[PDB]
Paper text:
In this study, we report biochemical and structural properties of [name], a GH5 mannanase from the cellulolytic [name]-E. [name] is a member of the GH5 subfamily 8. In [name], these eight residues correspond to Arg100, His136, Asn177, Glu178, His244, Tyr246, Glu273, and Trp303, with Glu178 and Glu273 serving as the catalytic acid/base and nucleophile, respectively. The conservation of active site residues and the distances between the catalytic acid and base suggests that [name] hydrolyzes glycosidic bonds with retention of the anomeric configuration through a double displacement mechanism.
Additionally, we report the atomic resolution (1.06 Å) crystal structure of the GH5 domain of [name], which revealed a unique arrangement of two loops adjacent to the active site channel. The [name]_32kDa structure has a His tag from a symmetry related monomer bound in the active site channel. The [name]_34kDa and TfManA structures differ substantially in lengths and positions of two loops, L1 and L2, that form part of the active site channel. Furthermore, L2 loop (residues 302–315) in the [name]_34kDa is two residues shorter and shifted toward the −3 site as compared to L2 loop of TfManA. Furthermore, L1 and L2 do not make contacts with each other in [name]_34kDa, but instead provide an opening between the two loops that is perpendicular to the main path of the channel and above the catalytic residues. The space between L1 and L2 is large enough to allow a branching sugar to bind in the −1 position.
Author numbering: 35 to 348
Write the structure that this text describes.
């Protein structure tokens, strides 16, 4: 006979603050399932009238969007209301959301660039919007937060910013970008990553490489990605390009193939709106105007539509 009981469930007395987290060098959801980001960057802070981009990005099959914010150091600060709206729209569309402060880009070289400390203060100002969204939102402290001048200087302020966010009570997975405009040409992030990782007492830290023309051969791509995997350190390709520019030709084929082989995340740059539209996946924010680059990223080998799996939390 069935026990025939009729109970109702109270929610667990104790639950973890962390949602998305790191386990054994990989990104995992709260339920333990491995998560491999396959997504797109959207320049929200510069295109407030293009928020339909989030739903259009989901329609590609993408499982993640990286949303460009400003902390007001250089561009126009994204308000807590705006950020709350974006997070909720991403959740409604079943997208994981990587938020990033762009104003740090090129610090130490570009005189208009802000500090990681200023970015951290901005994140702390968003705490009431962000707390409770640890299953859904990854905090990328500052985009490409050092230029090419003295990239060794990146390690101390990166470490300090992580510690400042943890001391403020953040339980999200935190993502950090490399010096040399995100491409880590001098290898400072690659060398110092373990030290930086060990400085996050939660272990919930992921490194992000941006692969442009420095990564113009197969060997350069595979060496970098394998370096992190072999060291047991979590990594994604948080931006990448592909079409040749004045500095070389990024090897997008090897990036995407190796990301698939190793199960590392990637986020293509970008949906639309670049000053030079060569990296626009769609022209004029219009899904019916895919560019050559859009065709490659969405529909080509190891691309988004082929490989992206929705986060299981949804
Ligand atoms: Cl706009
Ligand atoms: Cl080479
Ligand atoms: Mg029964
Ligand atoms: Mg939970
Ligand atoms: Mg909306
Ligand atoms: Mg060094
Ligand atoms: Mg290329």
């Amino acid at each position: 006979h069935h026990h025939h009981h009729h109970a109702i469930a109270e929610n667990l007395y104790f639950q973890s603050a962390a949602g998305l987290h790191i386990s054994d060098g990989r990104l995992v959801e709260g339920n333990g399932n491995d998560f491999v980001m396959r997504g797109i960057n959207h320049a929200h802070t510069w295109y407030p009238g293009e928020t339909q981009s989030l739903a259009d990005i989901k329609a590609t099959g993408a499982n993640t969007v990286r949303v460009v914010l400003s902390d007001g150091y250089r561009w126009s600060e994204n308000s807590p209301e705006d950020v709350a709206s974006i997070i909720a729209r991403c959740k409604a569309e079943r997208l994981i959301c990587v938020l990033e402060v762009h104003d740090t880009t090129g610090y130490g070289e570009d005189a208009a660039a802000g500090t990681l400390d200023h970015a951290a203060d901005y994140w702390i100002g968003l705490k009431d919007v962000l707390d409770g969204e640890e299953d859904y939102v990854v905090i990328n402290i500052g985009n490409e937060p050092w230029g090419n001048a003295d990239p060794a200087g990146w390690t101390a302020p990166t470490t300090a910013a992580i510690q400042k966010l943890r001391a403020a009570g953040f339980a999200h997975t935190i993502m950090v970008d490399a010096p040399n405009w995100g491409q880590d040409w001098e290898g400072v992030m690659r060398a110092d990553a373990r030290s930086v990782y060990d400085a996050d007492p939660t272990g919930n830290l992921i490194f992000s490489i941006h692969m442009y023309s420095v990564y113009d051969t197969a060997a350069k791509v595979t060496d970098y990605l394998n370096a992190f995997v072999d060291a047991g350190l979590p990594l994604l390709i948080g931006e990448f390009g592909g079409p040749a520019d004045q500095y070389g030709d990024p090897d997008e084929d090897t990036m995407m193939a190796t990301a698939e082989e190793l199960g590392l995340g990637y986020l293509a740059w970008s949906w639309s709106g670049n000053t030079d539209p060569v990296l626009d996946l769609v022209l004029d924010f219009d899904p019916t105007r895919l560019s050559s680059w859009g065709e490659r990223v969405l529909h080509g080998p190891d691309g988004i539509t082929e490989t992206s799996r929705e986060a299981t939390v949804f």
